[PDB]
Write a protein that binds this ligand. Structure first.
Ligand SMILES: *[C@@H]1O[C@H](CO)[C@@H](O[C@@H]2O[C@H](CO)[C@@H](O[C@@H]3O[C@H](CO)[C@@H](O)[C@H](O)[C@@H]3O)[C@H](O)[C@H]2NC(C)=O)[C@H](O)[C@H]1NC(C)=O
Lengths: 48, 48, 49, 96, 48
């Protein structure tokens, strides 16, 4: 029960940061380098 | 009867080995793509 | 002819082909029937048999 | 290893050497194993019969021993069409 | 290849799991970065 205020603060911070990220990085991580003319993502041995 | 155990799994492989070397056959294991070519051509040794 | 025997209709998916893979070419034999090398005829079938 | 001369020949649209036989080993089969080295040890006696057959009938084309261990010894010696990784292309040839 | 003497030569690597997309890599007997060979390496592994 005493952790109620902390949980409220956590939810409040999470909501604020979610909205900030929504307005800052919306639809930005949608371009990656494919190969020439193909639908294959180009990476190296140990890179995601 | 030639039996092939394909893939990586935790299932029992005893019965298929019994089927293999009960009906004058052979038992093979194919865990990956690299073993397919070698293990799909060895049955000609038993037939010879 | 030295060309390999064709089967079906060739379909390719150029969007899933890396440029540095060396895909396998062919290993099949050139097996052309007598009736597929000339115009098939009823007498020709009898002669072939 | 051996460095042949590889003269140009007729009836072979390639460069061939009649002094010995060439050996093809699949790329994913490591040469230098006990199994492979033993095969190369006793298959070296086929070159004399290869030469005898060629001299008896000069119109002979490739004559090859396809080993059950993956090796392929053929006469006359001639470079393979597809090197392992010298070009950007590789080969997938198992005599079996 | 289960042994150091077997882990020699070259082998095929199939990227994206396609059997038709091949690449050649040399076979090398690798050793894990964190191991338990001696007490010092074991202590480093347990600290990690
Ligand atoms: C496979 O490799 C072995 C080893 O290199 C070959 O055996 C070798 O054969 C030669 C020909 O006979 C031997 O030379 C002879 O040695 C005796 C003494 O042992 C000598 O008195 C003769 O005058 C002659 O020089 C050689 O010693 C022998 N090597 C060994 C280690 O025994 C064998 O020929 C190879 N297989 C094939 C099919 O060629």
């Amino acid at each position: 029960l005493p952790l109620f205020h902390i949980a409220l603060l956590v939810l409040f911070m999470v909501i604020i940061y979610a909205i900030i990220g929504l307005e800052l990085f919306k639809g930005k991580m949608h371009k990656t380098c494919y190969y020439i003319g193909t639908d294959i993502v180009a990476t190296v041995e140990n890179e995601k | 009867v030639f039996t092939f155990s394909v893939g990586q799994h935790n299932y029992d492989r005893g019965p298929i080995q019994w089927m293999a070397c009960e009906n004058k056959g052979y038992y093979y294991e194919i865990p990956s793509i690299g073993a397919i070519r070698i293990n799909t051509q060895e049955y000609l040794d038993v037939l010879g | 002819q030295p060309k390999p025997i064709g089967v079906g209709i060739p379909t390719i998916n150029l969007r899933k082909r890396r440029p540095n893979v060396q895909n396998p070419k062919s290993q099949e034999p050139v097996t052309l029937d007598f009736l597929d090398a000339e115009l098939e005829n009823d007498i020709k079938v009898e002669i072939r048999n | 290893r051996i460095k042949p001369v590889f003269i140009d020949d007729a009836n072979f649209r390639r460069q061939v050497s009649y002094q010995h036989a060439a050996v093809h080993i699949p790329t994913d089969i490591y040469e230098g194993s006990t199994i492979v080295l033993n095969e190369l040890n006793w298959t070296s006696a086929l070159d004399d019969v290869f030469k005898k057959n060629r001299e008896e009938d000069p119109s002979l084309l490739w004559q090859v021993f396809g080993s059950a261990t993956g090796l392929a010894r053929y006469y006359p010696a001639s470079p393979w069409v597809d090197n392992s990784r010298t070009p950007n292309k590789i080969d997938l040839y198992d005599v079996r | 290849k289960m042994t150091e003497e077997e882990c020699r030569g070259y082998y095929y690597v199939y990227k994206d799991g396609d059997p038709t997309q091949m690449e050649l890599r040399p076979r090398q007997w690798i050793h894990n970065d964190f191991h338990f060979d001696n007490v010092l390496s074991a202590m480093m592994s347990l600290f990690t």
